[PDB]
Structures are given as C-alpha cells and as structure tokens.
PDB file of C-alpha atoms in Angstrom:
ATOM      1  CA  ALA I   5       0.000   0.000   0.000  1.00  0.00           C
ATOM      2  CA  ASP I   6       3.033   2.371  -0.579  1.00  0.00           C
ATOM      3  CA  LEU I   7       1.580   5.629  -2.007  1.00  0.00           C
ATOM      4  CA  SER I   8       3.486   8.795  -2.961  1.00  0.00           C
ATOM      5  CA  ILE I   9       2.097  12.120  -3.998  1.00  0.00           C
ATOM      6  CA  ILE I  10       3.628  15.183  -5.610  1.00  0.00           C
ATOM      7  CA  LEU I  11       3.438  18.554  -3.845  1.00  0.00           C
ATOM      8  CA  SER I  12       3.707  21.781  -5.784  1.00  0.00           C
ATOM      9  CA  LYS I  13       6.315  24.283  -4.526  1.00  0.00           C
ATOM     10  CA  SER I  14       3.669  26.268  -2.551  1.00  0.00           C
ATOM     11  CA  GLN I  15       2.250  23.080  -1.049  1.00  0.00           C
ATOM     12  CA  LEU I  16       5.831  21.996  -0.161  1.00  0.00           C
ATOM     13  CA  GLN I  17       6.394  25.378   1.568  1.00  0.00           C
ATOM     14  CA  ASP I  18       3.161  24.943   3.655  1.00  0.00           C
ATOM     15  CA  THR I  19       3.779  21.294   4.506  1.00  0.00           C
ATOM     16  CA  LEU I  20       7.424  21.776   5.599  1.00  0.00           C
ATOM     17  CA  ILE I  21       6.361  24.681   7.796  1.00  0.00           C
ATOM     18  CA  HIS I  22       3.693  22.546   9.389  1.00  0.00           C
ATOM     19  CA  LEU I  23       6.145  19.738  10.023  1.00  0.00           C
ATOM     20  CA  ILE I  24       8.936  21.829  11.465  1.00  0.00           C
ATOM     21  CA  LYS I  25       6.592  23.925  13.573  1.00  0.00           C
ATOM     22  CA  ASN I  26       4.353  20.990  14.865  1.00  0.00           C
ATOM     23  CA  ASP I  27       5.921  17.556  14.358  1.00  0.00           C
ATOM     24  CA  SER I  28       8.461  17.347  17.165  1.00  0.00           C
ATOM     25  CA  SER I  29       9.544  13.871  16.074  1.00  0.00           C
ATOM     26  CA  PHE I  30      10.252  15.195  12.558  1.00  0.00           C
ATOM     27  CA  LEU I  31      12.300  18.083  14.033  1.00  0.00           C
ATOM     28  CA  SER I  32      14.237  15.751  16.485  1.00  0.00           C
ATOM     29  CA  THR I  33      15.304  13.622  13.563  1.00  0.00           C
ATOM     30  CA  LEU I  34      16.609  16.697  11.614  1.00  0.00           C
ATOM     31  CA  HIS I  35      18.433  18.036  14.682  1.00  0.00           C
ATOM     32  CA  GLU I  36      19.994  14.702  15.657  1.00  0.00           C
ATOM     33  CA  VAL I  37      21.358  14.360  12.119  1.00  0.00           C
ATOM     34  CA  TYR I  38      22.482  18.009  12.112  1.00  0.00           C
ATOM     35  CA  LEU I  39      24.400  17.382  15.363  1.00  0.00           C
ATOM     36  CA  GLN I  40      25.976  14.288  13.911  1.00  0.00           C
ATOM     37  CA  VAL I  41      27.203  16.098  10.820  1.00  0.00           C
ATOM     38  CA  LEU I  42      28.709  19.062  12.778  1.00  0.00           C
ATOM     39  CA  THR I  43      30.587  16.958  15.367  1.00  0.00           C
ATOM     40  CA  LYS I  44      31.878  14.557  12.709  1.00  0.00           C
ATOM     41  CA  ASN I  45      33.056  17.297  10.306  1.00  0.00           C
ATOM     42  CA  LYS I  46      34.680  19.729  12.811  1.00  0.00           C
ATOM     43  CA  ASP I  47      38.244  20.353  11.678  1.00  0.00           C
ATOM     44  CA  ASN I  48      40.893  19.769  14.319  1.00  0.00           C
ATOM     45  CA  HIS I  49      42.433  23.177  13.648  1.00  0.00           C
ATOM     46  CA  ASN I  50      41.348  26.537  12.292  1.00  0.00           C
ATOM     47  CA  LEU I  51      43.517  29.339  10.913  1.00  0.00           C
TER      48      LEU I  51
ATOM     49  CA  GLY U   1      -4.867  31.387   3.672  1.00  0.00           C
ATOM     50  CA  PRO U   2      -5.675  27.634   3.400  1.00  0.00           C
ATOM     51  CA  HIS U   3      -3.378  24.757   4.489  1.00  0.00           C
ATOM     52  CA  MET U   4      -2.594  21.242   3.276  1.00  0.00           C
ATOM     53  CA  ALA U   5      -4.866  18.608   4.833  1.00  0.00           C
ATOM     54  CA  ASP U   6      -3.558  15.817   7.037  1.00  0.00           C
ATOM     55  CA  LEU U   7      -3.616  13.173   4.273  1.00  0.00           C
ATOM     56  CA  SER U   8      -1.096  15.041   2.072  1.00  0.00           C
ATOM     57  CA  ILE U   9       1.089  15.808   5.035  1.00  0.00           C
ATOM     58  CA  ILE U  10       1.102  12.201   6.115  1.00  0.00           C
ATOM     59  CA  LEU U  11       1.973  10.878   2.617  1.00  0.00           C
ATOM     60  CA  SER U  12       4.648  13.573   2.042  1.00  0.00           C
ATOM     61  CA  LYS U  13       6.375  13.409   5.445  1.00  0.00           C
ATOM     62  CA  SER U  14       9.126  10.932   4.676  1.00  0.00           C
ATOM     63  CA  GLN U  15      10.204  12.533   1.373  1.00  0.00           C
ATOM     64  CA  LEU U  16      10.328  15.893   3.080  1.00  0.00           C
ATOM     65  CA  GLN U  17      12.393  14.385   5.879  1.00  0.00           C
ATOM     66  CA  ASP U  18      14.810  12.792   3.344  1.00  0.00           C
ATOM     67  CA  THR U  19      15.018  16.067   1.369  1.00  0.00           C
ATOM     68  CA  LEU U  20      16.195  18.061   4.449  1.00  0.00           C
ATOM     69  CA  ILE U  21      18.348  15.214   5.555  1.00  0.00           C
ATOM     70  CA  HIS U  22      19.956  15.072   2.142  1.00  0.00           C
ATOM     71  CA  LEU U  23      20.751  18.805   2.349  1.00  0.00           C
ATOM     72  CA  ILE U  24      22.047  18.660   5.897  1.00  0.00           C
ATOM     73  CA  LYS U  25      24.425  15.796   5.124  1.00  0.00           C
ATOM     74  CA  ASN U  26      25.555  16.729   1.624  1.00  0.00           C
ATOM     75  CA  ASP U  27      25.455  20.489   1.276  1.00  0.00           C
ATOM     76  CA  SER U  28      27.928  22.420   3.506  1.00  0.00           C
ATOM     77  CA  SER U  29      26.499  25.587   1.897  1.00  0.00           C
ATOM     78  CA  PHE U  30      23.024  24.749   3.159  1.00  0.00           C
ATOM     79  CA  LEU U  31      24.234  24.711   6.803  1.00  0.00           C
ATOM     80  CA  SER U  32      26.295  27.868   6.190  1.00  0.00           C
ATOM     81  CA  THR U  33      23.103  29.627   5.246  1.00  0.00           C
ATOM     82  CA  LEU U  34      21.273  28.459   8.365  1.00  0.00           C
ATOM     83  CA  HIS U  35      24.167  29.638  10.533  1.00  0.00           C
ATOM     84  CA  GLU U  36      24.466  32.998   8.775  1.00  0.00           C
ATOM     85  CA  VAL U  37      20.757  33.750   8.837  1.00  0.00           C
ATOM     86  CA  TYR U  38      20.471  32.755  12.475  1.00  0.00           C
ATOM     87  CA  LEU U  39      23.393  35.054  13.378  1.00  0.00           C
ATOM     88  CA  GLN U  40      22.622  37.881  11.028  1.00  0.00           C
ATOM     89  CA  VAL U  41      18.777  37.908  11.083  1.00  0.00           C
ATOM     90  CA  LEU U  42      17.208  35.921  13.969  1.00  0.00           C
ATOM     91  CA  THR U  43      19.343  36.869  17.078  1.00  0.00           C
TER      92      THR U  43
ATOM     93  CA  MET Z   4      32.123  26.228   2.785  1.00  0.00           C
ATOM     94  CA  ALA Z   5      35.195  24.974   4.774  1.00  0.00           C
ATOM     95  CA  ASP Z   6      34.415  24.572   8.521  1.00  0.00           C
ATOM     96  CA  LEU Z   7      31.355  24.783  10.702  1.00  0.00           C
ATOM     97  CA  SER Z   8      31.859  25.735  14.335  1.00  0.00           C
ATOM     98  CA  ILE Z   9      28.369  27.124  15.171  1.00  0.00           C
ATOM     99  CA  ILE Z  10      25.936  24.648  16.602  1.00  0.00           C
ATOM    100  CA  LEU Z  11      22.326  25.630  16.698  1.00  0.00           C
ATOM    101  CA  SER Z  12      20.024  24.242  19.359  1.00  0.00           C
ATOM    102  CA  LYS Z  13      16.824  22.441  18.302  1.00  0.00           C
ATOM    103  CA  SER Z  14      14.679  25.558  18.570  1.00  0.00           C
ATOM    104  CA  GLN Z  15      17.318  27.758  16.912  1.00  0.00           C
ATOM    105  CA  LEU Z  16      17.333  25.336  13.948  1.00  0.00           C
ATOM    106  CA  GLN Z  17      13.487  25.239  13.873  1.00  0.00           C
ATOM    107  CA  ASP Z  18      13.170  29.022  13.979  1.00  0.00           C
ATOM    108  CA  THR Z  19      15.756  29.463  11.226  1.00  0.00           C
ATOM    109  CA  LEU Z  20      14.374  26.789   8.947  1.00  0.00           C
ATOM    110  CA  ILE Z  21      10.905  28.364   9.217  1.00  0.00           C
ATOM    111  CA  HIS Z  22      12.193  31.875   8.588  1.00  0.00           C
ATOM    112  CA  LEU Z  23      13.922  30.765   5.430  1.00  0.00           C
ATOM    113  CA  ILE Z  24      11.052  28.599   4.184  1.00  0.00           C
ATOM    114  CA  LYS Z  25       8.669  31.533   4.742  1.00  0.00           C
ATOM    115  CA  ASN Z  26      10.777  34.390   3.415  1.00  0.00           C
ATOM    116  CA  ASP Z  27      13.761  33.262   1.336  1.00  0.00           C
ATOM    117  CA  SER Z  28      12.860  32.750  -2.261  1.00  0.00           C
ATOM    118  CA  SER Z  29      15.918  30.852  -3.580  1.00  0.00           C
ATOM    119  CA  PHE Z  30      16.139  28.730  -0.425  1.00  0.00           C
ATOM    120  CA  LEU Z  31      12.664  27.404  -1.238  1.00  0.00           C
ATOM    121  CA  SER Z  32      13.713  26.779  -4.911  1.00  0.00           C
ATOM    122  CA  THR Z  33      16.625  24.779  -3.650  1.00  0.00           C
ATOM    123  CA  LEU Z  34      14.382  22.707  -1.348  1.00  0.00           C
ATOM    124  CA  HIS Z  35      11.921  22.178  -4.189  1.00  0.00           C
ATOM    125  CA  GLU Z  36      14.588  21.013  -6.642  1.00  0.00           C
ATOM    126  CA  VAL Z  37      16.035  18.495  -4.184  1.00  0.00           C
ATOM    127  CA  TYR Z  38      12.559  17.330  -3.242  1.00  0.00           C
ATOM    128  CA  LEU Z  39      11.678  16.583  -6.864  1.00  0.00           C
ATOM    129  CA  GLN Z  40      14.963  14.739  -7.133  1.00  0.00           C
ATOM    130  CA  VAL Z  41      14.088  12.716  -3.961  1.00  0.00           C
ATOM    131  CA  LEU Z  42      10.526  12.033  -5.109  1.00  0.00           C
ATOM    132  CA  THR Z  43      11.343  10.835  -8.605  1.00  0.00           C
ATOM    133  CA  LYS Z  44      14.198   8.604  -7.204  1.00  0.00           C
ATOM    134  CA  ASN Z  45      16.615  10.392  -9.598  1.00  0.00           C
TER     135      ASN Z  45
END
C-alpha cells in the first residue's frame, strides 16, 4: 500500500512549515542528524 | 490562507524528511546559510 | 564552505528553517529542486 504524492512548490512550503513547527519527532530527527554532521566534520584546527 | 490537509502531510512526510536530511548531510552551503541567517537575522 | 563551528540548538534550527522557508525565495527553490529529485528517485 506504498503511495506517494507530488506537492507543488507552494504546497511543499506549507507542509514543511507545518512539520517543522508541529511535528516534534520530525524536528528531532533533523536536529539529531544536524548534530551528527557538525561533530563529525569539525576540523581539528582553524587558521 | 488555506493549508494542506492531514492526508497530504502524512503521505509527504518521509520525502520531506529525506530532502532536508539530504541537504544537511551533503550540502555544507546549506548549513552555512542556516548559521548565517540565524546570526545575522534571527538573534 | 570549509568549517562549521556554530551549533544551533533544536529551537534555533526550527526558527531558522521556518524563517527561510517563509521568506527566502531561492532557499525554497533549492528545497523544491532536491525534493523533486528525492521524489522521482533520480
């Protein structure tokens, strides 16, 4: 039963705002991955 | 103005998640922009 | 973009993502383009 739909650009804008604003599980997943990327990629030295 | 209904949101969620995840992992410029805008605009 | 030292908290990230999605016109184009790429598995 694996259905996909296509959002227009305006409907993508609305949907993403809903999800970031209201879906705390959606937002935790983004932030956990963001954290992972920053800690992994931090250069040992700067200039 | 009107909003998307729950059905569209529910069927879109995981592609939207993957889209942002793709950008966060693979586009250093995408995170630059978040950091700049937070510093420059939001604080 | 070489090195990222800033680390936003969850609600800093949320607030910034929403500001850009609301107000930044090319940022949205960029999301849309990658989304269509994700959707069409290409």
